[PDB]
Amino acid sequence: AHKKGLGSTRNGRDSQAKRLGVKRYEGQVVRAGNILVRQRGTRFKPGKNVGMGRDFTLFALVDGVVEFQDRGRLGRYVHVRPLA
Template sequence: MAHKKGTGSTRNGRDSNSKRLGVKRYGGQVVRAGSIIVRQRGTQFHPGKNVGCGSDYTLYALIDGVVTFEHKDRKRQKISVYSPEETATAVTI
């Protein structure tokens, strides 16, 4: 009886490639239209104002502007993009 495993007998030794998910642009960062903000599986973050959602739930900017993370309700967060004019008026009020 062999006391060492023969070649090819192991069932381990493989792994999938990482999918590079996560937040790509954080709150306060300036983005251009089409920039990916978050890559995710499912809607951990929901699209807000001026943010689109791809078929794989990727959130991306629809306009040039500044990223903001907001609370939709107790559990859900939404991501919006505001133009520089909108952010300037929001700060002065």
């Protein structure tokens, strides 16, 4: 056979993929303390009874239903509006 000098590597190292994404959308009731947007930078800016935390994560403050918004010269918006 004869197997002379070969080698190794240094890249058998991966980052444990952490489940990230948006959980709740317009049409779903979210009631007080339900995460609904997982992200790193401001992919989704809070608003109407929406909340952010110590890691840019949107959640529910009210017992309201989600909905979205676009404001270019400001950012992307989520507004979780409830009922009158």
